[PDB]
Symmetry: C14
Subunit: 112 residues, 14 copies
């Protein structure tokens, strides 16, 4: 939506539709105060993800993973957010009867 999403959505909206640049599909298991993830390069300001406070640590490339695992369920929360370029593919299917996490996303993210 805006630069910094800064939003609990509350849930999905009038996603300001775009070309894939500014807006990214931040969604996947989320909630844990993520203003926006991706953009801007200025302070989102920052997010926790996975409704946890774990996140991956090794560096993939320049841009490099993070991956809170939420529950025991499949919780491949990635946010390769370095602030270089940026590729991540989320999916989600936890407690099968959930608040539909099923659909999965991918994020592109140029800052440039």
């Amino acid at each position: 939506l805006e630069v910094g999403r800064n939003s609990p959505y509350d849930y999905r909206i009038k996603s300001v539709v775009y070309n894939p640049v500014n807006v990214v599909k931040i969604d996947a298991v989320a909630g844990v105060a993520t203003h926006i993830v991706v953009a801007p390069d200025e302070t989102y300001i920052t997010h926790a993800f996975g409704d946890s406070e774990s996140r991956t640590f090794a560096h993939k490339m320049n841009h490099f993973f993070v991956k809170p695992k939420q529950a025991m369920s499949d919780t491949n929360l990635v946010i390769v957010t370095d602030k270089r370029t940026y590729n991540i593919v989320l999916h989600f299917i936890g407690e099968e009867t959930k608040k539909n996490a099923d659909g999965t996303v991918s994020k592109s993210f140029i800052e440039t």
Copy 2:
């Protein structure tokens, strides 16, 4: 009715009758704060559907599905709302003794 329906109906009204352009038949299992769906191209503003927060994700065409499934019942909530052109056919028959969902709709939707 108006541009943005913006309404809980409360229930069906003096649907401002038309040619099929502006007003669409948004109805089907609904409730989950859908102002209007379809029109306008300006902010409806947006809807949840299916009284859920699931919705389809793949892209059909340009205009492309979304489909919250409400209950376990037959809940083919489609809103192919892209904002290109637009075709969707809803029907509804859940808990057979319901608040008559039986009758089913179709939506046309040119923005043009």
Copy 3:
């Protein structure tokens, strides 16, 4: 009575007697905020019928049915209200000991 009946009757009155044009016999199982049905062509404003929120959906002719079924009983609530011309024949006999629904009506309705 008036243009828009706009009334819970409360019950039948000094029905402003007429030729069959303006006033129609709206009666049959009713209650669910029907201001007036039929006339005017301007906003009645609108009615629910059948003390439900079901109503028929196919289009008969131009003017075309609607038919909330109230209970399980015989509840042929028709209001073919299109706003073309208009023919409907109601009858009523539900829970035999009711608040006499027995007598049945017919509605004419020219707007012209």
Copy 4:
């Protein structure tokens, strides 16, 4: 009494005695807010009868019946009130120990 009786009697009074024109014998099982029945031709304003809200529906002649049946008892509540001319014959004998309904009336009614 007056033009529009407009009265719960409370019960029978100094019935303004007449020739049978203006005043009619409205009595029989009554109560259900009947101002006056018969006269005037202007708004009585209107009555329910039979302490019910049933009334006959077919048209006898121009002037034509109405007949709420009160209880299961003999309740031939007629009010052939069209506002043409007007003939009706009431009688009453319900729960034999009642508030004497026994005596029965007849109504004439010219408006002319």
Copy 5:
């Protein structure tokens, strides 16, 4: 007493003694708001009798009966009050131990 007796007596008084014209012997089982019966020809105003609200209905002559029967007991409440001339003979003997109804009356009544 006065023109319109207009009185619950409270009970018998200084009955303004007369020739039988104005004052009549209204007494017999009474109570049910009878102002005066008989005279005047102007509004008594009116009476119920018999402590009931029954009264006879056929027309005897011009002046013609009315006869609430009070209880099951002998309750020949007559008031032939037409406002022509006027003859009635009351008697009373109900629950033998009563508030002495035993003595019985007769009413004359010229208005002329």
Copy 6:
């Protein structure tokens, strides 16, 4: 005493002694608001007697009886009060142990 005795005595007094004209011996079983009986010819105002509201009804002569019977006991309450001349003889002996009713009276009464 006075013209109209108008008194509950309270009980017997300084009966203004007389010749038998004005004052009469009203006494016998009494109480039931008898102002005075007999005199004056103007409004006593009136009495009930016998502590009842029965009284005799036939006409003896011009002046003519009345006779409330109080209890079952010997209760020959007479008041032949017409307002012609006037003769009555009371006696009293009810519940033998009473408030001495034993002594009995006679009333003369000229108005003239």
Copy 7:
């Protein structure tokens, strides 16, 4: 004492001693509001006697008895008070242990 004794004594006093004229010996069973008996000829005002409201009724002479009997005991309460001349002899001996009634009196009484 005074003209009208007018007194509950309270009990016997400084009986204003006399010749037997004015003051009389009113005493005997008394109490029942006797102001004075005997004198004056003007309003005592009056007495009940015998603590009852019985009193003798026949006429002895001009001056003539009265005799409330108080209890069952010997209660020869006489007051021959006519207001002519006057002779009476009281005595008293009731419930033998009483408030000494034993002593008995006689009354003279000239008014002259």
Copy 8:
């Protein structure tokens, strides 16, 4: 003491000693509001004696007895008080253990 003793003593005092004229020995069983007995000839004012309200009644001489008997005990309460001359001899011995009544008196009493 004074003219009218007028006193409950409270009990015996500084009896104003005398020659036997004015002051008399009133004592004996007393209490029942005796101001003074004997003197003066003017209003004592009066006494009851014997703590009763009995007193003797026959006339002895001019001056003549009175004799309330108090209890069952020896209670020769005399007060021959006429207001002529005057002789009485009291004694007292009731409930032997009493408030010493034993000592007995005599009264002289000239008024002269």
Copy 9:
């Protein structure tokens, strides 16, 4: 002490010592409001003695005894107080364990 002792002592004091004239030894069983006994000749004012209200009655001489006996015990309370001259000898020994009454007195008493 003073003329009229007028005192409850409270108990024995600085008895104003004397020659035996004014002050006397009043003591012996006492208490019952004796101001002073003996002197003065003016009002002591007076005493009861013996804590009773008995006292002797015969006359001894001019001056003459009085003798309340207090209890059953030896209670020779004498006060020969006439107001002539005066001789009395008290002693006391009642309930042997008492408030020492043992010691006994004698009273002289000239007024002269």
Copy 10:
């Protein structure tokens, strides 16, 4: 101490030491409001002794004993206080465990 000791000591003090004249040894069982005993010749003012109100009565000499006996114990309370000269010897030994009464005194006492 002072002239009139006038003191509850409270207990023994700075007895103003002397020659044996003014101050005397009043002590022995005491308490019962003895201001001072002995001196002065003016009002001590007076004492009770022995915590009693007994005291000796015979006269020894001019100056002469008094002797309240306190308890049953040895209680030779003497105070030969006449106000002549004066000799007394007290001792004390009552309830052997007492508030030491053991020590005994003697009193001299010239007033002169």
Copy 11:
């Protein structure tokens, strides 16, 4: 300490050290309001000792003993305080576990 010690110590202090004149060793079982003992010759003011109110009585010499015995224990409380010269030797050993009374004193005491 001061002239009159006048003190509950509270307990031993900065005893103003001396030559043995002014200050004396008052101590031994004490407490019972002893201001100072010994000095001054002016009012200490006075002491009780021994926490009692016994004290010796015979006269030793001019200066002469006093000796309250406190308890049953060894309680040779001497204070030979005459106010001549003065010798006394106290010791103390009562309830062996006491508030150390063990140490014993001697008092000198010149006033001179």
Copy 12:
């Protein structure tokens, strides 16, 4: 982040990304009021670590270890913070289901 981090993070943020100089990875089991560790050379101000108050004590080099061990679990909390140069490698894996401590850090730290 800032010079002195001075922060409870609250948890990881928009870590002001850097070259490894200023910001260090302070993280590992922490909480116990660590403002910042490492930088600045000015007052962080200081930290506790390990959520304890233990820390290593020997000196490694100039810059030299500290190592609170938190729980029993693997708690190699090092902070070689001397303020020379600085090398430390943390890791963490305590209660395996923890608040992910798993990922481990390393700190560089030039002050220069």
Copy 13:
């Protein structure tokens, strides 16, 4: 510390270190309001010791012991405080687990 220590320490302090003159080691079992012991020669003001109020009594030399024994334990509380010169050696070891009394002191004390 100061001249007069005047202190509950509260416990040992910055003992103003000295040569052994002014400050002395007062310590040993203490508490019982000892301002200072030893110095000054002016009012300490004074001490109790031993948390008792016993103290030795004989005189050693000029300067001479005092020795409250506190408990049953070894409680050689000496304070040879005369105010001449002064030697005392305390030690302490009472209830072996105490508030360490173990260490023992010695006091020097010149006033000079």
Copy 14:
């Protein structure tokens, strides 16, 4: 830190690092209001140590030990604080699971 540490730390801080002069390592089992130990030479002001109030007493050298033993555990609390020079070596290992006392210190301390 400062001259007088004067601090409960609260716990270890930004120990103002030094050469070993001013700041000393006061630590070891402590708590018992130690402002600073060692420096300054001016009033720390003073400390208790060992969370006790024991401390060593003999003099080692000029500068000389003190050693509260805290618990039963190894509690070699030394503070050789004389204020000469100064050497002490603390260690600590009490209740093995403690608030890490394990690490041990040494103190240097020149005042010079």
